[PDB]
Symmetry: C2
Subunit: 118 residues, 2 copies
């Protein structure tokens, strides 16, 4: 039946690494995770491993991560006030691997919970 | 600082028209709204108006809605067990206007609240 169509907001102080966000690139609203923040250096191994400040993150064990051929040069320094976003399905490479890190106005908010039909 | 990276789920009985969902098309996680459900007929006016079962929905007043040239034929009958999804920025036309209505396995869940930095 008809819902009221009201998406609520809750104000928060800051985002965290690993948060699931709604992000906007090319006027497209997508979902991904914050992988790095201002000042971080993002790099790749040839074996598909993400490196952040020269360390392989513990939470990156599950992911096989390849660059986009037209994205930024790497190693990549995340600018002030921006967030480096990665899709959890890493073979959809049109995240910060193509766009670079995103300014905060392009982060629409964090998803803490999804409601889901069984 | 580092968050725990846990997205929670809450089980719900069903989705509603106008709900904001995370949806998957071409292995891409996107955000849009449920605009129509199984059995509904979706049509367009030339002036950019969505019609659902031959009525212009009250909540469609704000939206200027054009077809994708390679999407389904319209009028379009929403199949059993599927959801017709529209992006709120309607000029990003790669929603059900291109893909058709989506089966439930391609609806990842409903967003009720976003957490957002001021």
């Amino acid at each position: 039946s008809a819902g009221d169509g009201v998406l609520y907001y809750r104000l928060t102080d800051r985002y965290h690494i690993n948060d699931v966000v709604v992000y906007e690139v090319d006027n497209t609203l997508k979902v991904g995770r914050i992988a790095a923040q201002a000042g971080d250096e993002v790099s790749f191994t040839q074996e598909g491993g993400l490196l952040i400040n020269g360390h392989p993150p513990e939470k990156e064990v599950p992911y096989l991560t390849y660059p986009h051929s037209s994205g930024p040069n790497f190693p990549y320094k995340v600018p002030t006030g921006t967030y480096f976003i990665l899709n959890d399905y890493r073979e959809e490479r049109l995240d910060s691997r193509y766009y670079g890190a995103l300014p905060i106005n392009q982060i629409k908010g964090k998803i803490s919970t999804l409601l889901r039909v069984r």
